[PDB]
Design a protein around this ligand. Sequence first.
Ligand SMILES: CO[C@@H]1O[C@H](CO)[C@H](O)[C@H](OC(=O)c2ccc(C)cc2)[C@@H]1OC(=O)c1cccc([N+](=O)[O-])c1
Ligand SMILES: [Cl-]
Ligand SMILES: [Cl-]
Length: 138
Amino acid sequence: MLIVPYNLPLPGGVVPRMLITILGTVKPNANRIALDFQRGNDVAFHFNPRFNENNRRVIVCNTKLDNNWGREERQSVFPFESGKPFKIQVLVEPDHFKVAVNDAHLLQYNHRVKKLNEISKLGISGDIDLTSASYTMI
Ligand SMILES: CO[C@@H]1O[C@H](CO)[C@H](O)[C@H](OC(=O)c2ccc(C)cc2)[C@@H]1OC(=O)c1cccc([N+](=O)[O-])c1
Ligand SMILES: [Cl-]
Ligand SMILES: [Cl-]
């Protein structure tokens, strides 16, 4: 595998046309996954599948500025399953991050942090076996 939590440096930050691909398998009895796109201590984009929030499955997205979480954005479409292999693709577009799972569009998240070239690391964490994490310019 890779060791989770896993840091993927994003050299010179993110830019439109940058595609991040994450391959892994969800652990049995998973509780959470998190992708954290970081600008130093700030989290520009937190993508957080929650397998059992009051017996519901929900993806929580948010931004952390100066250690404070903002307004959450919630999605009820939940393509992940305990025990099963997934592919997450995060495409940086001008106005938003665009997320697909298993080749199907899931959600978009408007840029709240504006200094895209300072979003210099991706943290991958949670209840997964992480196979690979990479980027390409499309
Ligand atoms: C108000 O709740 C917070 O919401 C944030 C997003 O708006 C983050 O998701 C926080 O979590 C972390 O930053 C965080 C969590 C764990 C670690 C190890 C590191 C960082 C925290 O999550 C929970 O409260 C929460 C409540 C119930 C369930 C879950 N979950 O992820 O399943 C999260
Ligand atoms: Cl590793
Ligand atoms: Cl900013």
